[PDB]
């Protein structure tokens, strides 16, 4: 700007918006969905 | 939140309330905006003789919220205390409203042409020649003829 | 010694070249620009001054360093004098004193001796015309010098600047008053110094009296001469009256107006961020989200660096209270990254309804939140996330049972779920009907919004928005 | 004397203020007259026509 008190105080980054939804939800996931085979 | 002090009808609290205001009124100009309704209680009170000064603080709040002509209405009934202050900026802004209101009334008066006269307050026409005495005393002739062309 | 001794002479000519021609070409150019036309203003050199001072605020200011004695401050401030065309001799004498630094032993006339120097344009008898040039002479030497921040005995010289430049304010209000057009050029200069007013006080004590002195210049610019002047003064208000209590939130109602017309560009864009944080404490989200979004898209151009990034950090804070937010790393910058890491995973726990994850974010990352002062929302944001969690489920399902959504959102009890859904209907969040026996919640698909209703009714605001820009383009076309 | 010119200077102010509707009303008429001139050139030649070879 730089006035007032402003100064006083593909990529994987783009996919990381969606990728972090995988971190907190359902992992990826292979193993668990692979364990669900013989469950029922 | 000193607004609640105005609920009392005893006078001697009001002069100490305005003594606080008019000093810090510069910083508190935003605070006076909500005192409108409770200033009118003092302005309309018959036993309140400071209504002349209460008209000034009523003109400051309306000037803060964007009201102008209403402050000119209170300037009329504000007595001699309003026209006695020639200091700083507030003198030239009120005469710009008052003399323009005066000169547009005189042009209206000449269109009568005679009879059926509109009411003319003695205070608005009184400061015309009163402030015009500051001209002849200042000896400057160039604008001495100018006021006569103004009022027509 | 001989190697570094011969390299000392060359640099000081560089401030004797560009820094000379800084105020020689602009100041000598703005001379005729401020004598007439003077439309508007414009006086584009005052806006060119924005491309100098802000450029000088990095390098070189007046000083510097660079390997001079800091003699440019006394040089231009002496021998104004001025008169008819002999003012060129003053610029010629400014060239004559350039050799004084390179030939004789150089002496520093700044600081202690700068007190009578600011009086010299008055002592030269006389200025005789432009206060903004002397205001520049009372600012550009001293105000860029404030960036040193040594705090010892020169802060009162920064205050002496704010003194003798308040004497320029005495010449600002008293002189002219009729078709000034220097005030509008000074409204850029008076802004800055009033910014430096606020800045210098923040290092010692916040200004109690200047708050009263701010309303002085504030109210007196109305109605006589106001262009962009009251806006910058209103920026001083909402800036500090925010960070300091109280009542200043609702104050914006009686002040506005707007104040029109918004100037200059991004300068008013940040103003919507100021009132944006205000309206965030009013708890109203919808008016806060539009003023914050407009604050980013209306703000050019940066860089550098985190000044626009930090203001954008706390800008999306209103989006945390909206209940609908995506992952905010799409707004991340490699420079802002390291600073937003405690504030990053926060919104990542907002997208989820887990209490153990949300409370762990508050414990570890609460230290970063102390500097922001955002703790007001953390108590009401728990109620915001539970609305996002139920909206995620209610939009994903037709019917949602209270017992199944009980532990899934871990409300843990049927009774408080009846209290939340009740308040969810009160807020218009959910349309779900509830059949109380045990009980359970049985909802149904909401429809009939259709086509003929919402889009064509919204297009009334879309076209009224577009047809006004047709006038905005014509108005902007009429100036050239 | 300064109030004299102060009563003189708003004349050309207001004289150019009525010069605003002067052009604005004139230019829109002539604009519609220019749009009427567009129908002119499109009217010519109408019919009939004869084929010819460009060189």
UniProtKB/Swiss-Prot annotation, chain B:
Organism superkingdom: Eukaryota
Coiled coil residues, start to end: none
Quaternary organization: Component of the 19S proteasome regulatory particle complex. The 26S proteasome consists of a 20S core particle (CP) and two 19S regulatory subunits (RP). The regulatory particle is made of a lid composed of 9 subunits, a base containing 6 ATPases and few additional components including PSMD1. Interacts with ADRM1. Interacts with ZFAND1.
Physiological role: Component of the 26S proteasome, a multiprotein complex involved in the ATP-dependent degradation of ubiquitinated proteins. This complex plays a key role in the maintenance of protein homeostasis by removing misfolded or damaged proteins, which could impair cellular functions, and by removing proteins whose functions are no longer required. Therefore, the proteasome participates in numerous cellular processes, including cell cycle progression, apoptosis, or DNA damage repair.
Family statement drawn from the similarity comment of this UniProt entry: Belongs to the proteasome subunit S1 family.
UniProt-recorded name of the protein: 26S proteasome non-ATPase regulatory subunit 1
Species the sequence originates in: Homo sapiens
Swiss-Prot record, chain C:
InterPro entries reported for this sequence: 26S_Psome_reg_C (IPR013586), CSN3 (IPR050756), PCI_dom (IPR000717), TPR-like_helical_dom_sf (IPR011990), WH_DNA-bd_sf (IPR036390)
Keyword Phosphoprotein listed: yes
Subunit architecture: Component of the 19S proteasome regulatory particle complex. The 26S proteasome consists of a 20S core particle (CP) and two 19S regulatory subunits (RP). The regulatory particle is made of a lid composed of 9 subunits including PSMD3, a base containing 6 ATPases and few additional components. Interacts with UBQLN1 (via ubiquitin-like domain). Interacts with ERCC6.
Protein purpose: Component of the 26S proteasome, a multiprotein complex involved in the ATP-dependent degradation of ubiquitinated proteins. This complex plays a key role in the maintenance of protein homeostasis by removing misfolded or damaged proteins, which could impair cellular functions, and by removing proteins whose functions are no longer required. Therefore, the proteasome participates in numerous cellular processes, including cell cycle progression, apoptosis, or DNA damage repair.
Record-stated family: Belongs to the proteasome subunit S3 family.
PANTHER family membership: 26S PROTEASOME NON-ATPASE REGULATORY SUBUNIT 3, 26S PROTEASOME NON-ATPASE REGULATORY SUBUNIT 3/COP9 SIGNALOSOME COMPLEX SUBUNIT 3
Protein name, entry field: 26S proteasome non-ATPase regulatory subunit 3
Lineage: Eukaryota, Metazoa, Chordata, Craniata, Vertebrata
Recorded name of the encoding gene: PSMD3
Swiss-Prot record, chain D:
Places the protein is found: Cytoplasm; Nucleus
Role according to the record: Component of the 26S proteasome, a multiprotein complex involved in the ATP-dependent degradation of ubiquitinated proteins. This complex plays a key role in the maintenance of protein homeostasis by removing misfolded or damaged proteins, which could impair cellular functions, and by removing proteins whose functions are no longer required. Therefore, the proteasome participates in numerous cellular processes, including cell cycle progression, apoptosis, or DNA damage repair.
Subunit structure: Component of the 19S proteasome regulatory particle complex. The 26S proteasome consists of a 20S core particle (CP) and two 19S regulatory subunits (RP). The regulatory particle is made of a lid composed of 9 subunits, a base containing 6 ATPases including PSMC4 and few additional components. Interacts with NR1I3. Interacts with PAAF1. Interacts with TRIM5. Interacts with ZFAND1.
Family that this chain belongs to: Belongs to the AAA ATPase family.
This protein's name: 26S proteasome regulatory subunit 6B
Source organism of this protein record: Homo sapiens (Human)
Gene behind this protein: PSMC4
């Amino acid at each position: 700007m730089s006035e007032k008190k402003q100064p006083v105080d593909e990529d994987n980054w783009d996919d990381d918006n969606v990728e972090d939804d995988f971190s907190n939800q359902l992992r990826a996931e292979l193993e668990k969905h692979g364990y669900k085979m013989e469950t029922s | 939140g000193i607004i609640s002090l105005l609920d009392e009808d005893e006078p001697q609290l009001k002069e100490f309330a305005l003594h606080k205001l008019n000093a810090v009124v510069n910083d508190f100009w935003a605070e006076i905006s909500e005192s409108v309704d409770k200033i009118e209680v003092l302005y309309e009170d018959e036993g309140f003789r400071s209504r002349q000064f209460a008209a000034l603080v009523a003109s400051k709040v309306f000037y803060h919220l964007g009201a102008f002509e209403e402050s000119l209405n209170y300037a009329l009934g504000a007595g001699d205390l309003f026209n006695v202050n020639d200091n700083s900026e507030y003198v030239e802004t009120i005469i710009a409203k008052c003399i323009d209101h005066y000169t547009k009334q005189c042009v209206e008066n000449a269109d009568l042409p005679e009879g059926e006269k509109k009411p003319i307050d003695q205070r608005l026409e009184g400061i015309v020649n009163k402030m015009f005495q500051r001209c002849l005393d200042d000896h400057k002739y160039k604008q001495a003829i100018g006021i006569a062309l103004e009022t027509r | 010694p001989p190697g570094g001794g011969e390299q000392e002479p060359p640099p000081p000519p560089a401030p004797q070249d560009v820094e000379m021609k800084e105020e020689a070409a602009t100041g000598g150019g703005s001379t005729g620009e401020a004598d007439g036309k003077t439309a508007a203003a414009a006086a584009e050199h005052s806006q060119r001054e924005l491309d100098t001072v802000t450029l000088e605020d990095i390098k070189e200011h007046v000083k510097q360093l660079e390997k001079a004695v800091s003699g440019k401050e006394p040089r231009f401030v002496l021998r104004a004098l001025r008169m008819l065309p002999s003012t060129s001799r003053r610029l010629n004498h400014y060239v004559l004193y350039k050799a004084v630094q390179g030939f004789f032993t150089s002496n520093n006339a700044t600081r202690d001796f700068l007190l009578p120097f600011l009086e010299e344009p008055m002592d030269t008898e006389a200025d005789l015309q432009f206060r903004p040039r002397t205001g520049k002479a009372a600012s550009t030497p001293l105000l860029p010098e404030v960036e040193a921040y040594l705090q010892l005995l020169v802060v009162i010289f920064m205050m002496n600047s704010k003194r003798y430049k308040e004497a320029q304010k005495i010449s600002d209000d008293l002189m002219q008053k009729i078709s000034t057009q220097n005030r509008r050029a000074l409204d850029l200069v008076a802004a800055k110094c009033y910014y430096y007013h606020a800045r210098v006080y923040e290092f010692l004590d916040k200004l109690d009296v200047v708050r009263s002195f701010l309303h002085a210049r504030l109210r007196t610019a109305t109605l006589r001469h106001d262009a962009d002047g009251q806006a910058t003064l209103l920026n001083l208000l909402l800036r500090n009256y925010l960070h300091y209590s109280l009542y200043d939130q609702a104050e914006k109602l009686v002040s506005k107006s707007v104040f029109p017309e918004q100037a200059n560009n991004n300068e008013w864009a940040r103003y919507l961020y100021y009132t944006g944080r205000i309206k965030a404490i009013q708890l109203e989200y919808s008016e806060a989200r539009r003023t914050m979004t407009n604050a980013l898209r209306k703000a050019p151009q940066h860089t550098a660096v985190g000044f626009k990034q930090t203001v954008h950090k706390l800008l999306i804070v209103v989006e945390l209270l909206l209940g609908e937010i995506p992952d905010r790393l799409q707004f991340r910058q490699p420079s802002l990254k390291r600073s937003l890491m405690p504030y990053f995973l926060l919104t990542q726990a907002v997208r989820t309804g887990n209490l153990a994850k949300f409370n762990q974010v508050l414990d570890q990352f609460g230290e970063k939140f102390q500097a922001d002062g955002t703790y007001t929302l953390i108590i009401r944001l728990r109620h915001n996330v539970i609305k996002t969690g139920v909206r995620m489920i209610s939009l994903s399902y037709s019917r949602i049972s209270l017992a199944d959504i009980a532990q899934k959102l871990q409300l843990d009890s049927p009774e408080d779920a009846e209290f939340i859904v009740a308040k969810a209907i009160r807020d218009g969040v959910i349309e779900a009907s509830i059949n109380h026996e045990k009980g359970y919640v049985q909802s149904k698909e909401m429809i009939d919004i259709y086509s003929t209703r919402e889009p064509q009714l919204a297009f009334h605001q879309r076209i009224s928005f577009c047809l006004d820009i047709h006038n905005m383009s014509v108005k902007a076309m009429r100036f050239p | 004397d300064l109030y004299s010119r102060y009563k003189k200077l708003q004349q050309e102010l207001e004289f150019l203020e009525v010069q605003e509707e002067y052009i604005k009303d004139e230019q829109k008429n002539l604009k519609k007259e220019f749009l009427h001139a567009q129908e002119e050139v499109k009217r010519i030649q109408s019919i009939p026509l004869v084929i010819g070879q460009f060189l």
